[PDB]
Amino acid sequence: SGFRKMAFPSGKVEGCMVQVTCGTTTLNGLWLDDVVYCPRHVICTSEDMLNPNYEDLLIRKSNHNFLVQAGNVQLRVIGHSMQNCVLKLKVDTANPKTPKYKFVRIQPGQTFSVLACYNGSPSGVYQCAMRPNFTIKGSFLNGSCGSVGFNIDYDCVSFCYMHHMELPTGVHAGTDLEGNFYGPFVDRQTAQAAGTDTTITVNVLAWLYAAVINGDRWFLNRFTTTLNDFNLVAMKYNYEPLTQDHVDILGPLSAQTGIAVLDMCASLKELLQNGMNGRTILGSALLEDEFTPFDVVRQCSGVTF
Amino acid sequence: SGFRKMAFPSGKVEGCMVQVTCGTTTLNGLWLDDVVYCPRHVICTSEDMLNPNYEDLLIRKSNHNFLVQAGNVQLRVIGHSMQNCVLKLKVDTANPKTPKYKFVRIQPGQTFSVLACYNGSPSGVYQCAMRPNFTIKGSFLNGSCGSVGFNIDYDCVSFCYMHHMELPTGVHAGTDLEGNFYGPFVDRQTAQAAGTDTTITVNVLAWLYAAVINGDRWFLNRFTTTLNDFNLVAMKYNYEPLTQDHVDILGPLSAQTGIAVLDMCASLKELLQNGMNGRTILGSALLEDEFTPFDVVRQCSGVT
Numbered sequence: 001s002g003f004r005k006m007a008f009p010s011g012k013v014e015g016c017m018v019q020v021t022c023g024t025t026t027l028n029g030l031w032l033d034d035v036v037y038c039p040r041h042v043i044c045t046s047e048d049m050l051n052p053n054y055e056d057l058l059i060r061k062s063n064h065n066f067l068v069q070a071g072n073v074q075l076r077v078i079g080h081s082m083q084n085c086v087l088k089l090k091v092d093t094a095n096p097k098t099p100k101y102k103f104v105r106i107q108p109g110q111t112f113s114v115l116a117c118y119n120g121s122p123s124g125v126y127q128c129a130m131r132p133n134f135t136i137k138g139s140f141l142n143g144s145c146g147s148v149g150f151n152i153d154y155d156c157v158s159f160c161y162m163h164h165m166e167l168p169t170g171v172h173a174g175t176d177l178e179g180n181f182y183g184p185f186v187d188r189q190t191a192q193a194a195g196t197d198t199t200i201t202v203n204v205l206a207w208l209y210a211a212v213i214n215g216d217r218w219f220l221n222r223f224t225t226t227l228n229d230f231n232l233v234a235m236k237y238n239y240e241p242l243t244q245d246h247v248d249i250l251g252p253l254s255a256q257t258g259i260a261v262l263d264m265c266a267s268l269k270e271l272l273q274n275g276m277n278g279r280t281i282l283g284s285a286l287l288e289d290e291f292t293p294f295d296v297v298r299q300c301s302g303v304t305f
Numbered sequence: 306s307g308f309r310k311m312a313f314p315s316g317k318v319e320g321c322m323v324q325v326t327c328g329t330t331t332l333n334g335l336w337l338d339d340v341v342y343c344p345r346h347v348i349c350t351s352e353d354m355l356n357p358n359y360e361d362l363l364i365r366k367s368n369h370n371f372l373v374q375a376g377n378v379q380l381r382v383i384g385h386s387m388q389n390c391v392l393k394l395k396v397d398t399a400n401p402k403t404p405k406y407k408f409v410r411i412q413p414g415q416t417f418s419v420l421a422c423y424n425g426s427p428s429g430v431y432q433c434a435m436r437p438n439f440t441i442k443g444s445f446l447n448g449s450c451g452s453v454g455f456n457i458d459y460d461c462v463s464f465c466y467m468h469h470m471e472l473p474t475g476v477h478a479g480t481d482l483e484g485n486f487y488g489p490f491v492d493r494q495t496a497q498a499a500g501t502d503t504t505i506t507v508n509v510l511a512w513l514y515a516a517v518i519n520g521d522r523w524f525l526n527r528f529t530t531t532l533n534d535f536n537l538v539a540m541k542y543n544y545e546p547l548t549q550d551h552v553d554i555l556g557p558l559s560a561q562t563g564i565a566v567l568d569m570c571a572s573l574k575e576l577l578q579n580g581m582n583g584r585t586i587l588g589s590a591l592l593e594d595e596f597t598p599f600d601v602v603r604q605c606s607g608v609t
């Protein structure tokens with residue numbers, strides 16, 4: 001009973017957060033086995049940030065220029081390399097709190113938990129989606145760089161995001177853990193703009209199913225729609241196209257509620273055309289698009305880690 | 306920048322969660338030093354639940370009847386006692402991951418993080434406010450009983466909530482860690498219902514300050530209101546009276562933004578009377594009342 005934006009328990013990731021210092025710049029690192037991952041811009045001065053030549057700045061660094069701190073303990077750096085926009089610091093000590101893990105690159109619309117950290121100390125946890133324009137709507141201040149985003153599958157932590165920068169209107173950009181940016185962004189202090197964002201239609205439908213599971217039924221209408229007729233209306237309201245793959249993915253939620261996906265689409269089409277008329281769904285006055293179908297099943301069925 | 310509903314990092318609490326089984330009832334316990342804390346209704350069959358005589362039921366139990374599992378390890382129960390609605394199981398092993406901690410009783414309008422657990426395994430974390438009607442708007446399924454709520458202050462975990470029950474309207478009730486219910490609720494199967502709730506005025510103002518700090522400022526106006534004139538309008542909308550103590554508690558946010566509390570109250574009065582006319586504040590189409598002034602300061606100033 002009840003429905004909440006819910007993060008993964010952060011304990012497995014908290015035990016991996018360290019502080020990385022290079023001269024005057026301090027940010028967060030992820031310590032897995034004997035490697036610390038962090039944003040490469042830890043090596044820049046504010047001067048360098050405008051247009052850094054990262055390969056050139058790193059040549060000028062030595063193992064000893066990297067101060068890595070895990071609580072009270074300094075970790076000795078015995079090697080360093082750059083992969084894309086991340087620095088990999090080889091340390092002489094493997095993290096005893098290393099969980100089972102993998103690095104994954106997520107798709108727009110997929111959700112993940114962020115452990116917000118400052119000076120290598122976990123400060124807060126919240127749930128985000130990769131927006132269709134490859135930004136995230138985060139909460140990050142100066143010091144938060146190297147904070148990571150993740151999912152848990154049972155006891156396996158999938159790292160999908162590392163935080164690098166803030167874009168116009170207070171949205172955020174970062175990389176996967178191989179250091180490749182999500183979206184066309186670069187780690188430089190330079191005018192950059194995200195594309196126009198859109199609503200994650202498959203997620204809105206997942207959340208209408210969550211609504212029915214939780215006893216909110218008012219928006220259910222007597223109609224069905226074709227996928228074509230649905231997309232004609234959705235594109236008019238800056239919704240992502242709904243694919244057959246999306247219809248097929250909503251199948252289990254459809255079976256749970258006895259409401260055909262295209263009947264739920266006809267209900268969404270009416271909400272977009274008519275609005276909600278001052279009414280709420282699951283305590284929201286707008287349609288929520290940061291719950292995946294898996295997130296809804298997770299929460300409504302209580303899967304654990 | 307940016308502003309999100311944010312929970313505390315849950316790791317210190319995850320290291321305390323165990324499974325407690327008595328007969329066919331499995332729920333969650335909190336393992337601190339050599340004591341496991343859980344809801345006393347772990348001892349009931351649904352038979353027992355109409356008016357359970359917990360004192361009698363507990364006398365009839367053996368330590369052996371309490372199966373306590375911490376991951377792969379069974380903890381030997383060597384004693385049991387009841388404090389209010391909480392069962393205390395003495396175990397032969399002190400939890401080595403016991404954090405620095407306190408038991409606190411929170412006030413209506415204050416917030417805390419919930420670690421939702423099933424079978425002693427953490428499932429998710431989210432933020433809740435203790436509502437003025439002593440309920441919480443949580444997300445809890447069968448097996449969630451014994452999940453706890455907490456705040457972290459530096460390295461100290463303040464445990465404030467243990468989950469016992471769901472109410473009509475999809476809201477939740479539970480106890481502090483001494484087993485005293487928040488609100489007039491009782492741990493038995495008897496029809497029960499929350500009082501009428503009210504909106505936490507000081508929290509809505511905190512959140513409007515969070516919006517301004519983040520550059521969401523369309524709702525600001527050149528007008529001011531007296532405290533009385535504010536309370537005359539807002540109380541018609543079922544808002545808590547704004548007191549001078551509330552005005553003082555907002556002092557840091559008022560000083561940070563340079564917007565006097567009674568300046569900001571003229572915004573809120575206009576939002577209540579006219580609505581948002583299709584706009585959002587921090588991506589919400591409604592006024593949010595589950596952020597305390599401390600929550601906004603914490604998040605906008607990055608305390609760790």
Ligand SMILES: *[C@](O)(C(=O)NC1CC1)[C@H](C[C@@H]1CCNC1=O)NC(=O)[C@H](CC1CC1)n1cccc(NC(=O)OC(C)(C)C)c1=O
Nearest residue numbers: 026140141142143144145164165166167168187188189306
């Ligand atoms: C990150 O480097 C960090 O936390 N550094 C530690 C102190 C040493 C920050 C995190 C951001 C600060 C505010 N919010 C954030 O998310 N990242 C940066 O400062 C960026 C580094 C560059 C990519 C390499 N960064 C630098 C300069 C400007 C900006 N953004 C910016 O000006 O945003 C506008 C105003 C929207 C254009 C930036 O993100």
Ligand SMILES: *[C@](O)(C(=O)NC1CC1)[C@H](C[C@@H]1CCNC1=O)NC(=O)[C@H](CC1CC1)n1cccc(NC(=O)OC(C)(C)C)c1=O
Nearest residue numbers: 332346445446447448449450469470471472473492493494
């Ligand atoms: C709790 O005891 C639990 O998780 N037990 C473990 C499975 C063995 C549950 C938690 C709730 C189940 C669904 N969501 C929850 O939050 N708590 C209870 O079942 C209550 C136990 C009583 C306090 C001692 N409880 C018992 C009977 C009825 C109800 N509520 C109820 O019927 O609510 C309606 C359906 C909204 C009227 C209840 O919460």
Ligand SMILES: [Cl-]
Nearest residue numbers: 285286590591
């Ligand atoms: Cl809303």
